Design a binder for these strands. Structure first.
Lengths: 98, 93, 79, 106, 91, 79, 98
DNA sequence: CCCTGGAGAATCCCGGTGCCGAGGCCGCTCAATTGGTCGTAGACAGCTCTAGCACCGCTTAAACGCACGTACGCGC
DNA sequence: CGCGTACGTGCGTTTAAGCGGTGCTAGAGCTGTCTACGACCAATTGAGCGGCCTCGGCACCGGGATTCTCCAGGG
């Protein structure tokens, strides 16, 4: 008896191929919807968001975070590194001007 | 009910002109409608700026011709100019 | 509504980085991008709040979300 | 009067020339809008519509699909170099990103 | 001919809060460019604001909403208070 | 006019790096900076060229350069 | 005798402090002017440039290169280096979207 | 320590349902189309005059190139 | 921690940037002039669209399969 014991990285590459060719949204709607209301309640109380309004906000948030993640990824291989770091994200925000 | 302005069937007519064996979903139709309106605001906004930059009151075909050279770069620009020029000459004829 | 920044779960960030082609993800990455997402959400929603209050409306529409993203050079297609 | 022939057929076009001229006047752009301005605007919009849909159909036939899915529209924009530069700061919903892997990643 | 400029207007604002300093032509042209660039940004946003809600007019609320859309942080709320106090001193 | 990309000399690129806070300047960055500067100049001037032709002018003015830089989010103060 | 022999890097910060506080133009005007003409020759043969038109182009290119050099520089410390590389410049343009 | 044969599990092509979103049809109605009518921006002709193109002297700070070595890039 | 070469530093030496000056035409404002052009007004009109009938492409459900990957054995 012997388990499969996949080495790290190959399933990570496999998950990259499965999600880059996918269409569906990775982050669930209800956790993202409740985060929007919590942030908006600090600016204006008794505020409602439509179902398509949260849907439009969620798609733009994933694409912005994915594009930040791609820039974080190529910054790591520029630094002769495989694993991303929190300092890589701070580098990406400053260069992008955000 | 109230009619809303959209390019749902004009994109369909363009799609059937060159690809008469394919269909398109409504989600992709709204993206193409969003793409047309965004480019429409960019070219007309540049054409509005171009008339104001030269102290001109009207937007002519040259204003649209100058606007698409600023936004569309290089190889993609010359086909838009060529299609724009051939549309104006056909319209005047 | 409190502690709602934890709604973006750890594999949800991992799934997002898999879409970005990230090989390995550090443990401190998840806490960093939650603040980044909070900062990004604190600008688009605030811009959409001004769009909603300008129209004398109490509910934020998807039209106002698009215009909030459009003015910052992040225009969204398909609403 | 005479027959109400559309301006799109006169210019050999399918996009509505009159609709484009109407939003130019009511869009607060200029005091007057020229006659050839909607004709030039419709021709440019048609070429961008035709070029994107042609590459989207090529992307649709790559994975054996007839219906155009918003992934195909995203794939058409990102694959084309001019469409990537024109829509670099443009976010497409339900499109994702390009399915590319780094050389050192393997 | 006559060229519209904000060179004189910046000068009176300068001695209002700092009467011990002057200004140069290069600094004045930069400040003239700063006023003009913000002018098209606020009015362009206000013009776009009127088109979103099908509004045929631009009011003080159009300028007010465009300020908070453009100016970030406490800079928007300081200009809002300054803008509100000008309307009250108007009427 | 030929051999004008070498007008941006080696100390000229080094001086630009010193303004940007660069401590050590590589020998292969001079060809890379020339290509980036040529690419950046090939977009601003070409945009200013289209502004010049539309204005019925055969000479490029500084006003059209500001307009060319403004539409790319690189507006210049002081003209 | 024996010269002072400044260590490699000491004069680098001395030039950094001088050029960051003085607003003189580092690029010479005439080499940048003739480069503009040969670039514009591919678009229009019979073209002229004003004295202030070349002046406006030069400072915009100087500030863009310095800002690019700023993004190029902090990528080295992100990569545990102090020397800028062409791959750092390509990192900056890709992240910025240029 | 490296090359090669067999098998566990994620992945891909395929047969059958059908279903819910897409394609075409019914009006008609509201925006698109036709003709006239002027104020008016724009193309066109002549003057000009103030800024740019081309060349000259020099002179001098800016720049190409060679010798040396230690902070740093790269290999392990 | 170690190898190294290549870029920091220093100046010799050439070389053009720039200041000042000259001449001239390339051409943008400037002023008339005359001329089609588009907003606006009557008059009209025709398929885009809300919605309904129909219909079919691929999500879903499994079945089967090649197919690229890991573990164990041999040299």
């Amino acid at each position: 008896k012997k388990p499969h014991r996949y080495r790290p990285g190959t399933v990570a590459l496999r998950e990259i191929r499965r999600y880059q060719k996918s269409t569906e949204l990775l982050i669930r709607k209800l956790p993202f919807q409740r985060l929007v209301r919590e942030i908006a309640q600090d600016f204006k109380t008794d505020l409602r968001f439509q179902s398509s309004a949260v849907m439009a906000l969620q798609e733009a948030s994933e694409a912005y975070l994915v594009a930040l993640f791609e820039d974080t990824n190529l910054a790591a291989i520029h630094a002769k590194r495989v694993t991303i770091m929190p300092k890589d994200i701070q580098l990406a925000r400053r260069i992008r001007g955000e | 009910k109230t009619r809303k302005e959209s390019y749902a069937i004009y994109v369909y007519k363009v799609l059937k002109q060159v690809h008469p064996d394919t269909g398109i979903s409504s989600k992709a139709m709204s993206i193409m409608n969003s793409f047309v309106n965004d480019v429409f605001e960019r070219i007309a906004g540049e054409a509005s700026r171009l008339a104001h930059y030269n102290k001109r009151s009207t937007i002519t075909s040259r204003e649209i011709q100058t606007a698409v050279r600023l936004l569309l770069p290089g190889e993609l620009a010359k086909h838009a100019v060529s299609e724009g020029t051939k549309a104006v000459t056909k319209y005047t004829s | 509504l409190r502690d709602n920044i934890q709604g973006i779960t750890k594999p949800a960030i991992r799934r997002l980085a898999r879409r970005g082609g990230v090989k390995r993800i550090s443990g401190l990455i998840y806490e960093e991008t939650r603040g980044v997402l909070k900062v990004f959400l604190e600008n688009v929603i605030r811009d959409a709040v001004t769009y909603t209050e300008h129209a004398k409306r109490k509910t934020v529409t998807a039209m106002d979300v698009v215009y909030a993203l459009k003015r910052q050079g992040r225009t969204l297609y398909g609403f | 009067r005479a027959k109400a022939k559309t301006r799109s057929s006169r210019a050999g076009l399918q996009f509505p020339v009159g609709r484009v001229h109407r939003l130019l006047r009511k869009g607060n752009y200029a005091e007057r809008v020229g006659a050839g301005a909607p004709v030039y605007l419709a021709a440019v919009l048609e070429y961008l519509t035709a070029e994107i849909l042609e590459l989207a159909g090529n992307a649709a036939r790559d994975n054996k699909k007839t219906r155009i899915i918003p992934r195909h529209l995203q794939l058409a924009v990102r694959n084309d170099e001019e469409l990537n530069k024109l829509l670099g700061r443009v976010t497409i919903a339900q499109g994702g990103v390009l399915p590319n892997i780094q050389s050192v990643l393997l």
